Amino acid sequence: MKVLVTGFEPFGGEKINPTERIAKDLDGIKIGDAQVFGRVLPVVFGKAKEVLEKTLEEIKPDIAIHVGLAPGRSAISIERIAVNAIDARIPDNEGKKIEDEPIVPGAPTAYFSTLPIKKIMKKLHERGIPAYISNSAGLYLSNYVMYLSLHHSATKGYPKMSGFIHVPYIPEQIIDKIGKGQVPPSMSYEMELEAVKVAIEVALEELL
Amino acid sequence: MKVLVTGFEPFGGEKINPTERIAKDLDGIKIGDAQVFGRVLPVVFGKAKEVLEKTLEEIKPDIAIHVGLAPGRSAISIERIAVNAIDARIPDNEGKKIEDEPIVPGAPTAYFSTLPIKKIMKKLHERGIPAYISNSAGLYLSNYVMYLSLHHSATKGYPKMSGFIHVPYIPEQIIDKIGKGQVPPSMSYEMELEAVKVAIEVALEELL
Amino acid sequence: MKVLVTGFEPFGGEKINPTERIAKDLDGIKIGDAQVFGRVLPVVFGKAKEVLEKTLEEIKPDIAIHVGLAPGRSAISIERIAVNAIDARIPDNEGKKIEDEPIVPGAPTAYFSTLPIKKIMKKLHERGIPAYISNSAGLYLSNYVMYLSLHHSATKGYPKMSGFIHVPYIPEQIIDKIGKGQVPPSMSYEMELEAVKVAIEVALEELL
Amino acid sequence: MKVLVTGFEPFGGEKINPTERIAKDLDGIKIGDAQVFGRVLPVVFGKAKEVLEKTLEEIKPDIAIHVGLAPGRSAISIERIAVNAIDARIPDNEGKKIEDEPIVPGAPTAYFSTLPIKKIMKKLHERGIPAYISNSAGLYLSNYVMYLSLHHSATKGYPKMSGFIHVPYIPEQIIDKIGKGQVPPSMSYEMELEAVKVAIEVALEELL
């Protein structure tokens, strides 16, 4: 079994992205039988697609789990739908703000996630990790790589399970927002890392 | 040196209060030289005063730090003011909802906290624990024991340093609010317990 | 030109639904040349589809604008996507909580709204009405009638423009939440009614 | 009877302050028998005190009602306590950020508002205006003029009733926050202006 876990580099003035450090910490580990591969994608439209399609070609994983920073979210949000659109409020890391573009012209409006999302969520809960089902992943880079990967799954037969997990801020990133009058929700790094490993595990008890 | 730490029992339909477990975990420990005493107060107007005045009489602490559950807060809130008023929205644990009462008739409108609150906050930050100064402690039981203790300090000469710390929900308490459509901020138990020990330590580097 | 405007009856313990009163206030009026029809649908899965398909059959409108109460929203939210799913958190008004059902089995995952949503939003703004594009309509009755209507548009050729608008609470509904410790955003009735007539007007300058 | 109503000029990057326009709209009107005077104060520490003490000297009002913009509040908040402290997060309009200063050295820690605040709140509610009792006015300019005026009342015998009202944003100010990714609560200008006149009226049925 081969399992891809991606995370992103820091974007829009974040000094840090907790998902980069999750991609890197799950890289090369094995959950029993299954090899896990962890890769960090650019927050750059175009380049992220390119890098993601090479990686899926090269590893050809059975389960792909894409992870992102969802600022101001208070729990682990498990994504239900990727939609065929970019409408970037902020620019990707190269300066490209893209308003109202399809991701794949002619490809479906939307794709549902193939991860067992309610089981993942229920498991997280009995681990005492607060989690819920999100119904929008935005229309920036999370939804973009969440859509391109459910599309390659549909087009090429692999990955077999694909989806997206949004994690809160970690505590160490809150303490300079406090500074400009703001205190967002956070979640410890350790809870987040564990949440994406509990996810990998209910994905494997399902995907055969 | 003697240090009191209080926490409260669960109130208003919480199954758990993280501050009860913090009172109990700091009880009997020693931070160097200083003995720490941890006591859990009732969320019962009247009875909490009684219990708190006996304890301050019996231990006669140099530093008193009172800790409470602040539901929906996203960070450790360090309290600046206790005010002379009850206006309970919900009832205390015995059924007493008290609207617009003074705590001590004739006593001052307000008391400022004697804890080094900005230093505490600054230390918490460099520990990567998100923290801020709160300017209202409500007008229920946190403000009641926060005022009664700044009053005994003013009346009797001890404690020398007194204040209040509000902690978020812990994660294990969020997962049934998710159930009734709500996901509040949470903070890990371990971050909270550490935050109140980093507080005890900057209090002692100050109080001589 | 014929224009359908729907609103819903009160649901889940709301004493009132502002959209029922908007359906009823735009009924029978004319914006120039165009006749406007206002109808109130049930918040009852099944029955709402039935009632909505009869109405579209009987009026055969060129523009259909479906309006709902979005509790806790602070502005007029103009909906981008209806998705093929019910996952009701609360029960519809008859007692049916439906978890994970398709609306139309075999029909597309999603439909984009055919209303000129950015122009509507930009117009609202220059009218000083705060408005934004929402990317999820839930998976209760708003998304259900928002999807059934973009599906009849796709299946039957009419309506030509279809979409959904979510309005805040009106002020008179906030004052009893204050009572159980909550104060949600509200918007005046009059701002809301005006917002859906500014919408009808940029829809008609577009739809020929 | 003489009634002072103050409002503030725009501060910290607000293009507008709705309270300036309320001070100006109630100026010179009469509620029956009672003359109402409306004055706009600077958001400048020092200068606001000066201007407010001249005005109270010159009008010598029986009721003073001080009104301010509370950004991000969703309802009319009626203030309970002015406290003797500045701790400005942002600078006043002249560049002075003042951290941890007393307003009046030697004067009381706090003052309770003399307005009949629950009656005001109850009346607002039966007018369908959402309103609640706030327990902190910040430690910038609202709390500063809210304290200076409860202090002149205590020192000089007039005003007889004094307090502070915090109003939400008005809608026209929300539409450029939407732009930088934010949509705060708003309240229509008209609801706000009416709320401070319903206040003046329950203050006069009380103050003799």
From Swiss-Prot, chains A, B, C, D:
GO BP terms, alphabetized: proteolysis
Catalytic machinery residues: E79, S142, H166
Signal sequence extent: none
Keywords associated with the record: Cytoplasm, Disulfide bond, Hydrolase, Protease, Thiol protease
Domain of life: Archaea
Cellular component GO terms held in the UniProt record: cytosol
GO molecular function terms listed in the Swiss-Prot or TrEMBL record: pyroglutamyl-peptidase activity
EC number of this enzyme: 3.4.19.3
UniProt subcellular location: Cytoplasm
Catalytic activity: Release of an N-terminal pyroglutamyl group from a polypeptide, the second amino acid generally not being Pro
UniProt keyword Nucleotide-binding present: no
Assembly and interaction partners: Homotetramer made of two disulfide-linked dimers.
Function noted in UniProt: Removes 5-oxoproline from various penultimate amino acid residues except L-proline.
Matches recorded under NCBIfam families: PRK13194.1, PRK13197.1, pyro_pdase
Protein family: Belongs to the peptidase C15 family.
Name recorded for this polypeptide: Pyrrolidone-carboxylate peptidase
